[PDB]
Write a protein that binds this ligand. Structure first.
Ligand SMILES: Cc1cc(CNCCS(C)(=O)=O)ccc1Br
Length: 330
C-alpha cells in the first residue's frame, strides 16, 4: 500500500503545516501537525475541556462505530517549548492520503496548553518519531507509521514541505519526480527516539564550506533551524544590524536586510536554504525588527533541523530495520 497527502502551511510564515487525516467511521477529518520529533497521535476531542477549545475541529469517538476505549490507558506529553496536553486513549481507524491503519491509538485530549488552544488551525498532532517515545501508559502505543509499515510497498515516508506553499507527505514510496539530482542517505541514531543524524558542515552565503560534524534531529514539528551558537553567530554576522535580543528571545535583524543563504552538508552533498526562508517577519505588527529563522540551540540540549531546513529539501525517512535519512535538492 501507499498514501499521499498534501500538507499546507497554517499561516503566511510557514509556522507549521497541517495535513488532513480521516479518523473513525464515518470519517471525521481533522487537520493534524505531522511531527517527526514526537510519537503520539493526539487530537482535540469531545472530551477536551470546553474552555480550552477555540475553533479546532474535534474528534467525537461516540460518533465513530469503530472507536473503542483503550481501557485504563492515559497519556501526557510535555514538549520542548513547555507546551503540554494529556488525556485518554481510543483505538480507531485512521487514514492518511488513502493509506488506512486499523486499531490506531488515537489519544483524546482532556487538557491542552494555551499554545494549542490559541492555534485554531491545528486539530492535533500525528507523531512520526520512533514509538519508544510514545507516552501512553501503561501500555505504550505505536505510531501511525509503525502500524502501517508492514503493509507499505517500502517502509518509508517522505516530507516535501513547501516554502509559502503546500507540500506533500508520502507513505510507502519515493516520488522520483519530486526532487532534482540524487538523494544522499545518511546514518540515523534512534538512541533518543528521534531521527537523529550528523550533518557534515555548513556555509554562510557564498562563503567557504566549514567541515564540522553537527549532530541534530530532523523535526517537521519545529518551525526553525536551531544550531550551535558558533554557527548561528557566523550566520548573523553577515547581516548588518542583526543581533541576539534576550528580550525578544533570539536573533533579530532589520526588516530592510537581504538575508544570505545557509548551506548544510549531508555527506558530500549540500542543501541550500535560500535567505528568504530565514525571514520570519516583524517581531510584532508594524515593527521594523524581524525575527530570524536560524537560532541558537544552546538552551535546548539538541540541534534541530526544523522546517526552515527541511523545506529546502526532499527528505526520506527510511524506516527499514536500520533506519536512515535521505536528502535531495528540489
Ligand atoms: C504546534 C505545536 C507543535 C509542537 C511539537 N513540536 C515542538 C518542537 S519544540 C523544539 O518547540 O519543542 C509543540 C507545540 C506546538 Br503549539
Amino acid at each position: 500500500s501507499t498514501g499521499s497527502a498534501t500538507t499546507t502551511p497554517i499561516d503566511s510564515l510557514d509556522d507549521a503545516y497541517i495535513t488532513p487525516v480521516q479518523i473513525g467511521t464515518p470519517a471525521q477529518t481533522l487537520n493534524l501537525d505531522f511531527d517527526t520529533g514526537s510519537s503520539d497521535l493526539w487530537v482535540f476531542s469531545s472530551e477536551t475541556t470546553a474552555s480550552e477549545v477555540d475553533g479546532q475541529t474535534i474528534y467525537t469517538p461516540s460518533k465513530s462505530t469503530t472507536a473503542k476505549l483503550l481501557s485504563g490507558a492515559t497519556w501526557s506529553i510535555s514538549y520542548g517549548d513547555g507546551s503540554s496536553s494529556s488525556g485518554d486513549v481510543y483505538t480507531d481507524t485512521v487514514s492518511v492520503g488513502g493509506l488506512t491503519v486499523t486499531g490506531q491509538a488515537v489519544e483524546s485530549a482532556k487538557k491542552v496548553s494555551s499554545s494549542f488552544t490559541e492555534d485554531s488551525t491545528i486539530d492535533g498532532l500525528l507523531g512520526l518519531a520512533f514509538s519508544t517515545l510514545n507516552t501512553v501508559s501503561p501500555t505504550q502505543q505505536k505510531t501511525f507509521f509503525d502500524n502501517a509499515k508492514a503493509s507499505l510497498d517500502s517502509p518509508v515516508f517522505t516530507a516535501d514541505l513547501g516554502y509559502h506553499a503546500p507540500g506533500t507527505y508520502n507513505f510507502g514510496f519515493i516520488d522520483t519526480t519530486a526532487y532534482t539530482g540524487s538523494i544522499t542517505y545518511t546514518a540515523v541514531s534512534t538512541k533518543q527516539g528521534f531521527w537523529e543524524w550528523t550533518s557534515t558542515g555548513y556555509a554562510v552565503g557564498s562563503g567557504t564550506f566549514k567541515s564540522t560534524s553537527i549532530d541534530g534531529i530532523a523535526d517537521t514539528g519545529t518551525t526553525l533551524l536551531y544550531l550551535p551558537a558558533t554557527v548561528v553567530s557566523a550566520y548573523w554576522a553577515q547581516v548588518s544590524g542583526a543581533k541576539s535580543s534576550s528580550s525578544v528571545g533570539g536573533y533579530v535583524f532589520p526588516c530592510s536586510a537581504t538575508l544570505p543563504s545557509f548551506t548544510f552538508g549531508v555527506g558530500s552533498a549540500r542543501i541550500v536554504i535560500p535567505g528568504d526562508y530565514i525571514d520570519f517577519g516583524p517581531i510584532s505588527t508594524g515593527s521594523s525588527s524581524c525575527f530570524g529563522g536560524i537560532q541558537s540551540s544552546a538552551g535546548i540540549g539538541i540541534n534541530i533541523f526544523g522546517d526552515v531546513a527541511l523545506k529546502a529539501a526532499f527528505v526520506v525517512f527510511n524506516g527499514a530495520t536500520t533506519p536512515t535519512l535521505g536528502f535531495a535538492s528540489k
